[PDB]
Paper text:
Recently, several unexpectedly diverse compounds were reported to deplete cyclin K by linking CDK12–cyclin K to the DDB1–CUL4–RBX1 E3 ligase. Here, to investigate how chemically dissimilar small molecules trigger cyclin K degradation, we evaluated 91 candidate degraders in structural, biophysical and cellular studies and reveal all compounds acquire glue activity via simultaneous CDK12 binding and engagement of DDB1 interfacial residues, in particular Arg928. Crystallographic dissection of 28 ternary complexes demonstrated that despite considerable diversity of the molecular glues, the overall complex architecture is highly similar. The low-affinity DDB1–CDK12 interaction primes the complex, while the ligand, through filling the kinase pocket and bridging over to DDB1, drives robust association, offering a rationale for the unusually broad chemical diversity observed.
Residue numbers in the entry:
A (entry chain B): 715 to 1033
B (entry chain C): 20 to 266
C (entry chain A): 1 to 393, 708 to 1140
The structure:
Amino acid sequence: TESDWGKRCVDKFDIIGIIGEGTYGQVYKAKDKDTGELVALKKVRLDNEKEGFPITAIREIKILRQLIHRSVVNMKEIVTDKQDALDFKKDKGAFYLVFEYMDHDLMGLLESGLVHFSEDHIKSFMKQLMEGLEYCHKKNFLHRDIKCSNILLNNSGQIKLADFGLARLYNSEESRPYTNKVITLWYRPPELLLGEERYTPAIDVWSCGCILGELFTKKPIFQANLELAQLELISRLCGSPCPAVWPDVIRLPYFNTMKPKKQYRRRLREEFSFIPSAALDLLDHMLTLDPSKRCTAEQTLQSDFLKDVELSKMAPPDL
Amino acid sequence: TKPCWYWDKKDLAHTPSQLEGLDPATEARYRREGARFIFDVGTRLGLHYDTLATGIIYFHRFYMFHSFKQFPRYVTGACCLFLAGKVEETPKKCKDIIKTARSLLNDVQFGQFGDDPKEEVMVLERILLQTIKFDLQVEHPYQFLLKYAKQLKGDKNKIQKLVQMAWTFVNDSLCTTLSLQWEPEIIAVAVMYLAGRLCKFEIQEWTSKPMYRRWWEQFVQDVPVDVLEDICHQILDLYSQGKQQMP
Amino acid sequence: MSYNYVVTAQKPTAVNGCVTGHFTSAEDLNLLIAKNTRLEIYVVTAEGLRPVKEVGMYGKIAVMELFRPKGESKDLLFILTAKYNACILEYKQSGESIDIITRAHGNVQDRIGRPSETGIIGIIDPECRMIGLRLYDGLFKVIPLDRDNKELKAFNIRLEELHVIDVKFLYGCQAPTICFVYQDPQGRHVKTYEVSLREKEFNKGPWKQENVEAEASMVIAVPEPFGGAIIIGQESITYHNGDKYLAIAPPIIKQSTIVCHNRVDPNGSRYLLGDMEGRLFMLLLEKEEQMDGTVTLKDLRVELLGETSIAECLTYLDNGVVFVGSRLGDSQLVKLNVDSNEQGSYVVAMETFTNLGPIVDMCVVDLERQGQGQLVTCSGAFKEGSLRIIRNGQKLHIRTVPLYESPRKICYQEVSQCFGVLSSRIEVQDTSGGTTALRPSASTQALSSSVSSSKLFSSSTAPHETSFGEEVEVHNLLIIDQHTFEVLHAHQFLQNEYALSLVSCKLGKDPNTYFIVGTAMVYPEEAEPKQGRIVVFQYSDGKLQTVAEKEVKGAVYSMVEFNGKLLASINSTVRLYEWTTEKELRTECNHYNNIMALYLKTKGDFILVGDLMRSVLLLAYKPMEGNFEEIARDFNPNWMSAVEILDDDNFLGAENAFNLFVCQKDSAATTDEERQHLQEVGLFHLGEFVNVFCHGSLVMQNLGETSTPTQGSVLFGTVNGMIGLVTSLSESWYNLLLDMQNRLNKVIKSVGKIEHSFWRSFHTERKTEPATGFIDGDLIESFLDISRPKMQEVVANLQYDDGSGMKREATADDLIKVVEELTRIH
Ligand SMILES: COc1cc2nc(CN3CCc4sccc4C3)[nH]c(=O)c2cc1OC
């Protein structure tokens, strides 16, 4: 049946090339020999033997067989290298996670400098992204590494969220020890820079807001190489972390340790004056320092900017 | 889409273990010993209750596809717990599982691990993943016992007594094939049903529908009393075969 | 890591801008000509321009303007680079010593902003109170010109109009006032604001908004006798000033877009207008004086003067002399006469200044068998199209072959003692239903001619409607003699067929040498071409014969001969064809993991592929198997303009952001993933747009005499005419020259005080990285021009790391010899 994963052989795909390099293996583009559908194969190397099957892949197999959404990438199946019939122990062959193929990634469309996004294109893009994030956040899953690299785009304008390698469940009743270094620095929330370690789904919202700004400027908003340098850049635009705008900032580990040069005032509206008002309000709410005051995913979908968007009119990005 | 993980009691007469000449009593014993091994080892390591159960469910499902005579059970158990830790985000190093297993198993038992215990366990992971068809997410009776009980209102102390007695019954059912016969939701109502009988409580009074004698039907729809009683019979059988008494 | 060296063989020749004023002395009239990164200062005389000074800047010159603030004796120069380096410059001369003073400087880049579509605009107030900059959509940046602003500090005023076409400061206002054309969904409009330095915001402008032509392109600030502004469009010219409104729409300007303007008479009575087809117009402001004594604008008139080169910028000098500054063709000095000549023209060319124009393609060929090599470049565009033959002899000797049509690709076929050149010419839909060419050109002035009769796409049934006046491209293959450079034959391709790739080679066991062209059927409706041809031609006995054609399902962007087989890239696919004994192409194998296989280069059984957005991929042909294998890919995303193979492990690429990089096989065989990862080992901001990499050298080296340390030779041509050379170094030579650059950068004074390290940093809108693996040879070659005192300062405390001389302290004369050896590679 369709559900008996781990048995079908990778022979069933004609490998077309290596589309990317992943955390646990290299990612290949392949055509299905039986149907002709183009897929993406992620190689899992269990030959490491230090801790067996990578947990980053386990998270993606566990979570993506639960999540069904237009804007969440789909894992079609899991296939294997030709195994050793005589002995099960000797076998070191690897496993491939089959995903739907996506024509491009946002970083690539932007880094190559080719794409131009209009307001409506940004609406169709953000509406899909936030709708996907809501599905995940309502299912009590955290993405934990939202980056332009991980937003896969079809030429048609469909968006799918993809790398669930750092995804974990969130419990309101139980605050749990989490890893305080999840999202890449350019898209990392301020709360985690100070090392909260017990964080909300708001970490992902901050990233998606950073993407919203980046779609209007065509340049990433907060680019730095050091955690303190990022806090300063964020502080210049969103304001310096202070007790008045973020009451519980003091309970964060590094609040005394990490400090901006000045107590900068918030200038988000001024520096983003060119952004349409309907969107600017979204950015100010998404890039709010306090995780408890930062808007939710659903609230973004019930915003003047994204609420009245029609996904049927998926106006393709200008390519 | 998703695989079917439930059999009929009658089907357990035809596990690989049975067909290789193992009798029903022996396979049942092996299942209890392997499950309790997973339980005790993980408890020594400080593991969450969900992590213990997941390892146990992997274990029970494994021996629906393989024979106990070809896969030593304590190696399988250790591997199940090892994978369960990564699935449930309570990971442990394989060497630590082996260390604890050595403490708990005598030298004959630890013989199953062979000359290289870590290797025998790590090697099995490939077969375990393929066997459980990479369907790693598992739900357990505990969450439903708590979700369903939260909707009971009445004497705080009588309901808490109901919950703990039922929770004990959930822990004991992991030693049985009930995990392979009924969805967790039915097991949760069944353990509530049994404890209510034993404590002489009438649960319907605590429900929003106090004159609905079939209180379970708001929680799990379409559950016959026969199903709920068959489960109760199987749980108490463990209490009559061993020399412990209904809690 | 990798070590490479990059030098300029020919400096940029395209004129990016030109201004005239009183810069060197309050007395002389100067013409400042800006080429990419180069500023040329001339003194205007009646006989002709006199050169006085040339400086380089560590930046692309984006804005160049002359202003004279109250209290200064002479004009000062403002320049803004494309990396947002701003500065104010002064000319100072002490007898024979000429130097350029940096009076103020700073970088005006904003952390958050959207670069505008119509590019950086810089204007200065008529009272020299402020400099206006339009860098980002929705923002106007003001640098106030006070004496104390030596760092050029500035502030932003919110601008409601996000899409601005053009802006100028207006003459004759009570306050500093800007006039600009902007676009919103309702069309284009002209609007005014007043700029308040005290309030640091805009105040309501002197006159109301007026709706203007949809393609309104340029804004002219009209001098005080009249006041107001003129707006130039595609069909109409309009004048605006409060209540006054005029419009002239002479049909002559509709034919060709007007791109440049310049004021002739300081009063504002006459302006020069130029268009893309090279026509020069006089725009006349007819005056009417009322009894009140006030001077008003009565009417506007446009008069055709003649033809010039297609000019990016125009500047009137004196008498009838106009400087025609061309980026697509040769820059010129032309005389405007009051009386027309017998042909009806008032324009008579005086001098012609060489511009290698856009170098679309080029090849190196040893025409005279002199063990040297000469460079034949496809240069220029439209009526300025030419073939330029370049040889070394101390200056470069350049011979110009005019084509009067666009040259696209060139390849040399020795067997036939001729070049094959792909060209396109513009025809316009005419009343016959066909098309008519605007002027005769190479493809029409061929001795013998032929037209493709292929029936491949003839089934059509796809409608493409034509409107009278629309332009089309007509593509040809030209057979040009290598000695006379006379067009022997021209072959015209199908209607709507674009010639994209050209090679000359023998295939298989076929002894005949063929010209092979790869084409794409281009219809305006299509996002990406879906039909194409590979055509095999034979040039024999003065006639071109069609030998074979292969239909493909896409555009044949690039082709290259591969071990007797034809390697061609059709859109995403990279294909290898065999040439059968029946003289037809037969497919052997394909590679499909590409978005757009724009560029191909080969060495041995290895193939380097350049992609529109996926950087470079190293493929290999596995002869044992008859297929392709991916050796290594560059996973860093870049948009390629040209690629070249340096050696079996190093690969050279050019980015559309004016950057260069080198990728190498990671040479670590521990994991397969390492071998599949190309590590970008070199990063370098070139500052030019490289279209063509080409192995070869222009110097006549026997190599029996001392060989320079540099090894290998790659020449490249750029959009601004710049020709450069890339070569490799040993680890020892790189470190010496690198350590020296750091020493040279501390000693040498930069114009505008621009840090050299900043200039060469890799730069996209998104990223900035320090340069790596590249020696700026133009910096190294400047050691020989710095003062002897300065030379000694550079060589202090220097030790080598070469195995022959374990550690060798340097003298100035020792390094003078090392650099002089390096200047011999070009
Ligand atoms: C590791 O994450 C993934 C990234 C992916 N990127 C792309 C875009 N490609 C388009 C084709 C090519 S040629 C060289 C690079 C590129 C990028 N397409 C995918 O299907 C995809 C799937 C993934 O995981 C399931």
